[PDB]
Design a protein around this ligand. Structure first.
Ligand SMILES: O=c1[nH]cnc2c1ncn2[C@@H]1O[C@H](COP(=O)(O)O)[C@@H](O)[C@H]1O
Ligand SMILES: O=c1[nH]cnc2c1ncn2[C@@H]1O[C@H](COP(=O)(O)O)[C@@H](O)[C@H]1O
Ligand SMILES: O=c1[nH]cnc2c1ncn2[C@@H]1O[C@H](COP(=O)(O)O)[C@@H](O)[C@H]1O
Ligand SMILES: O=c1[nH]cnc2c1ncn2[C@@H]1O[C@H](COP(=O)(O)O)[C@@H](O)[C@H]1O
Ligand SMILES: O=c1[nH]cnc2c1ncn2[C@@H]1O[C@H](COP(=O)(O)O)[C@@H](O)[C@H]1O
Lengths: 376, 376, 376, 376, 376
């Protein structure tokens, strides 16, 4: 009868809010702090939220948390410790190729959901450049048995990177490539048609990044993630959001805008497994953290600063906190998996809301004298 | 003749400003500080402004000021002292059920407009969770004679809370329930159809709240109050605005956007009747005030911080100041009652105006070296 | 309790449609056939709809139907017969002043609601031009005892008509003037500030009018009526909609857009009381009907054509049909009086809807071979 | 005091309507029948409206009415009779060059405002093509003493016409050229920079024109006149509106949109001075009138039809009717000259209003059985 | 076949972002920090980016970096040192005319791309006012052999500056003039029609400028550069962006919005070649830098402040850093020259994106305790 025959059994669900297509096609460029996700319906607890995410077209991870190929973020210690907690690590290329191959064979010769391949060894990634001298680095890393390579450049739509991708896709046919950095859909077109397996989205949004203030180029991070994800889902290519991630909420928004995995350099810096040693400044324990374009890491123009960030403990205590935060955020969204989050987003069911500056002020902590924030 | 026959006796009234439907349907999310109310016509003094507001569908209060169920806001002292000044108090559930039932029978076994029931006892409320173990807490509070229960959760549209509401509405048919927290109209649909008697509007806008910065979810408070109030007036269900209230102007804007009562945790914290004891920090007398999701009040994710706020004296001196502020704001609006304020708002007679950031700068205090603000 | 305290007793009333301010401020120029009125609530029968309308600032009629000062519409027969049925008649000036004064004293020396003055004589109007020779015509009509004069010109915002209005308002202080024709608000400003008592709205919308196709000037009739009525209600000045009226629905739309009375030349032509004699053409009984600017009624440029329209019987059988049609249209609107219609329109309660061309096709008669329409 | 010191003496003038910049920048393409001019203030009679208009940058006419270079519109009879009534005539080029030079010396060897040069001879124009064989025609017309040449082509932005303009502007330095046809501003840029003295606006809007229905190109006439006039006033170049003119109102709208003179082929066809002879069809006296692109006037593609139009008498009786119509339309606009009309239009003082289809129906003649229209 | 015949060989290029016409015609006024440039395709290294830019209509520079005529920015040391690195220097007029002529002959009597004239001497510029006493200064500078003069005023659209330009363009026919300051297109019209050779864009955007906070006039800098450049390219007149430049990214955005050269006062102040001497304040080596309207540099109203800025070393080490930054920014844009940057911008190929305030926060450095930024 008429309880089913009118609308086909689906309930009313009063329309309130904006979809992702109605929000990011206004022409205005939004970052992570400029919007928020409207909540929905819960019929499940937070611990049964599946976090299975695809790194590349054939590599599948158990947590959507990858780590950045920087000289003060990841080496083989972080490549082990991110893999054991579900993610993957990318070992930087600010070193000799023998050293980087040593780090890749150090992680490869090494926990319930530990992201391991068919030979029961830990997954690893490594960064290479697009210069002709890096083909020897690629050969020496592929002899070490690297599973995925990322082509590290701040501007990914070059002829050099397209020729390097077409070199890898026939010299090493079982090796996965990650192209980047891209922020528009035309760059995603030029790299997907070259045969890339994943994209790396974000230019000018890093915490150690002065590309927008020296080279005047890039775009805001949330709009970048949405515009490259909406193009890259046409061909079945995952993207990787790097830059702009400051907390768990930015990770949840990046995963809800279409990014399959999230790359973190500063939120994972000054951890126990990050390379370097601790020191003190104004009575605060903190580890050094510099960008790859900074002149302390290289006429040379600097695209990075050389700073420091406070200690965050160990990473087997920090990554499960990020896991539980993403699970509680997917509970408040109302979806049992990240695939369901993105499926609700592209179908128009998952809705958003733009946020002004004084509504960003109330979104944090206000109206207090002094607070003692303990995340975990 | 033509002085009456043209427009039916109603005057010209030049159209200037935006109605609430024209302001909160622009897609952009506004908070309390992003707009202001345009004034009207006065033919009445401020002392004859009636402040009668409905808490639930059958509980009627004399002042639109309810107090928050937090462990550093309300216990039976605040539940007495908010009831005697016209409002009501909600006793927190961060304790054993025998302790909470003791506080409810302490306020129940206890001034011209003192909000009292048919047995001339003081009105009281109590918070319960939605877990199965809280049915025993509900039974032990209903034996103490609680008049209204609020189902305390940061996300109110769950199957657990709907089953708890359908459990209360047939086991205790004369007990009023308050569902929350809701921010959209679909959640108000799922809770009103479950049989709720009032709603509790606001997610991510508290002063001790980091839900938007960890779980990436919620919406700005003023848009939330308007969108849930405009849906909940279709069924005769009052809503309760909590979060974001910093002063008397936010209370007046929340009551003008459709909220029947306003819930305050931080503006009533560090009062004399609030639980805890005073201490000093940098020569400032202040009382501790933490959120319910903070790890000092509970892998566990934290949705709250643990801070402190300065002393505000007693509450029989502070709530009449809020009463006089709401009355003077309803005088400048031009309405003799809050029902007339909301009736002017939904009819399009009461008009609003959006406010930029530098017009928020001029709205406060500027152009001075140092000022000594004394509210009361 | 909460059934009254939320919205002040006023019901929900789901918002659907456009107000008159939202419809006629789109920039596009609408006529009578380009929109329609959305219906409302009925708690009254059609026979108790009061049709009291103000002609000028001191003349009050019982029906909102005045008749046009044309040489084939009104003489003293129509000035009697429109007055006896509630309206008023305006006697044309296409004659010698002694003849027009004879017609005014013929109607003045002449039924339940018969529109009569303090001396129990029938109300009458007369048209004069703005030339200096028409002051003698004005004196000879005011000796006959005319109650209201209309200053007949297709363009009312001239220095000649303003000087004539300032001549009448001090030589004849108890004589009501009607200025016109006006279509914009600036012309209404220049004539109301001159001291006019009513306006006459419409330029280029008559059925015998080629002003828009020769002099390229005017505006559509419904937008003209709304824009002059919304300005003229600021000063308590009624307006008169002439031109474009083809049926009862155009009269109802003109009265709902702010016009106090409606002037009809072609819908009242070829009546029994209209001057002239009948003849036949293709076996159809029809009376001649020409405009005042036509060269058969006057290098001279023609602003009118000289046509003919079919017989409509007597006018004591035709005006009560218009009365019953306006009453049934005010019943479907939901207002017991025209003052209530305009009060609902300016308050935003009475709503409109724009209508496309194929929705104008379905609004009439379609899908039939041949029909026999009998209005009365 | 404050009657002058507030607004500088200028009155209020309530803003109502759209300017020409707000009307023709909506993206939608409007013709003459899609809009109308809003009236203003009169302090002058119609007979003192000055109609002085500039044909080219140095030729000044007394009436803004030029006549079209077509083989059934103008020869030396029309070139005499349009010049004597204030305008100018353009003699067609559908003939041998000796014949066209004979017609130019026939008009040159020939009344209060008769448009005559320094030698007291009548002004004349002649059309030439852009082919290389037409340089001999240009030489044979300049020996006859032609005052202005129009370069007749349906598409004026060619390299052929630009080379012909640069040929005339140095071989004949005192000869005025008129380029066309142009409809966009880029074509006006390419022809004004070539050194043209006037433009000829309109492509696809003639009554005998099927360019839009065969070659799919052009634009609506009113938008074309506005967009080329607003560009050509930057350099002091008049434009000439041809095509789409059906009555006096289209001439008044074309002069109010920025055109200095108006070119008419069909409204001046079947006059006594037009070439050809009369005949009868269905008892109607009418003269043949074909376009220049029609195959009866020439694989050849046809851009014209070969029709006929009814007799309009003599042209010394018809052009003063157009003069009086333009003067009465400039009276209802409120400007004493065409320069004042265009100055009010570009300043935003003269306002317009868009017109729907059913408001085009009421703008003509409706609601009649049959009418006898006599224009003059 | 169909790989070429569909779209003419040009690739798909998915449309994403806003053009400069779609960004700066929204009505809202944008500065340099309110937008950013979307990147494109690279097929070239950064060192082969040509930086040839036109100062005036006949002076051509090798780097788009000119220096400001201020008393603490440029004298003959800076006029030498900016010319040797490719740019040009403008010597201030806050001195006697003999002193300024001495500085011009000091630079004129003085490295691979060194911007030198036909006599192999260094290019130089000098500022003059618009007063009548400055004609003697102009004569004494033209005897020294100045190549270009800038008419220094904060408001360039005066009768004084137009008469001075018409004085220079006939007394000194081979001398190039630069008019300014202009921000709108009407001022560019009044100065280009006076015969100016270059424009100087910017009013109220200097770092030492309080014109917008005292005289309430000007416009934001990026919108000013775009609106004057889009008008001045119609006549082949370069413009000069001064004010608002803080880093290399502002120079790249100014060159991408249509400015041919960029003028810098504060970014070149406290260099070794800037006039003045160093001192210390709070242990920081810094040189004094005041505006020309400041009362320390002159009832007189002040349009400037008198501050100081930190040391930047030498300018043969600083200008090649700006060169390499502009080259890397033109690499990320995807154009091999500044002419190609502006050609991609006006064709709609080069696209932009608006940037919010919290996306300006992420564009710089965030999420760090303290950083050590080393640009070069
Ligand atoms: O030196 C640099 N200049 C510009 N971007 C960088 C640099 N170093 C790292 N990045 C990017 O910034 C990301 C990490 O930044 P985060 O947001 O602070 O974690 C990395 O994934 C890179 O994509
Ligand atoms: O720990 C928490 N996490 C998130 N929201 C909270 C928490 N504790 C209290 N709240 C909410 O914040 C309100 C009071 O916040 P206030 O605006 O600072 O008064 C309460 O009514 C609750 O709805
Ligand atoms: O000759 C004319 N030219 C232009 N308008 C006219 C003329 N004669 C009458 N009118 C107007 O047209 C109205 C009647 O036209 P109707 O709409 O056909 O009834 C009169 O009230 C006048 O305002
Ligand atoms: O054969 C033709 N094909 C297309 N346009 C024509 C042709 N002949 C004349 N025209 C144009 O149409 C105008 C006259 O058309 P009218 O509007 O009917 O007067 C002339 O001024 C020409 O610009
Ligand atoms: O005193 C002043 N008042 C207003 N503008 C000034 C003044 N002095 C210099 N300027 C302008 O500011 C520019 C340099 O400012 P900067 O952006 O701080 O480099 C110069 O090119 C001038 O156009």
């Amino acid at each position: 009868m008429a309880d089913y025959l009118i609308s086909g059994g689906t309930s009313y669900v009063p329309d309130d809010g904006l979809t992702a297509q109605q929000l990011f096609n206004c022409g205005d460029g939004l970052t992570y702090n400029d919007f928020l996700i409207l909540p929905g319906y819960i019929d499940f607890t937070a611990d049964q939220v599946d976090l299975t995410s695809a790194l590349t077209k054939k590599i599948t991870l158990k947590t959507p948390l990858v780590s950045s190929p920087m000289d003060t973020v990841t080496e083989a210690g972080m490549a082990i410790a991110m893999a054991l907690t579900g993610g993957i690590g990318f070992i930087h290329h600010n070193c000799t190729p023998e050293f980087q191959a040593n780090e890749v064979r150090k992680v490869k010769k090494y926990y319930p959901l530990a992201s391991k391949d068919a030979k029961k060894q830990l997954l690893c990634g490594a960064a290479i450049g697009t210069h002709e001298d890096d083909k020897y680095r690629l050969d020496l890393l592929a002899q070490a048995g690297v599973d995925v390579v990322v082509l590290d450049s701040s501007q990914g739509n070059s002829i050099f990177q397209i020729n390097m991708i077409k070199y890898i896709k026939d010299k090493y046919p079982n090796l996965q490539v990650i192209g980047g950095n891209v922020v528009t859909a035309a760059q995603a077109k030029n790299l997907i048609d070259a045969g890339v397996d994943a994209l790396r989205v974000g230019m000018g949004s890093g915490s150690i990044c002065i590309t927008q203030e020296v080279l005047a180029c890039g775009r805001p991070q949330a709009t970048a993630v949405y515009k490259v994800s909406e193009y890259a889902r046409r061909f079945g290519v995952p993207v990787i959001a790097d830059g702009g991630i400051q907390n768990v909420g930015h990770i949840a928004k990046a995963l809800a805008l279409g990014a399959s995995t999230v790359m973190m350099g500063s939120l994972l810096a000054a951890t126990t497994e990050a390379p370097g040693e601790y020191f003190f400044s104004d009575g605060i324990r903190l580890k050094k953290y510099r960008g790859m374009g900074s002149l302390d890491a290289m006429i040379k123009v600097a695209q990075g600063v050389s700073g420091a960030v406070q200690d965050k403990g160990s990473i087997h205590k920090f990554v499960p906190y990020l896991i539980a935060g993403i699970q509680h955020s997917c509970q408040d969204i109302g979806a049992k998996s990240l695939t369901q989050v993105r499926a609700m987003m592209y179908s128009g069911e998952l809705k958003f809301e733009k946020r002004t500056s004084s509504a960003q002020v109330e979104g944090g902590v206000h109206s207090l004298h002094s607070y003692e924030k303990r995340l975990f």
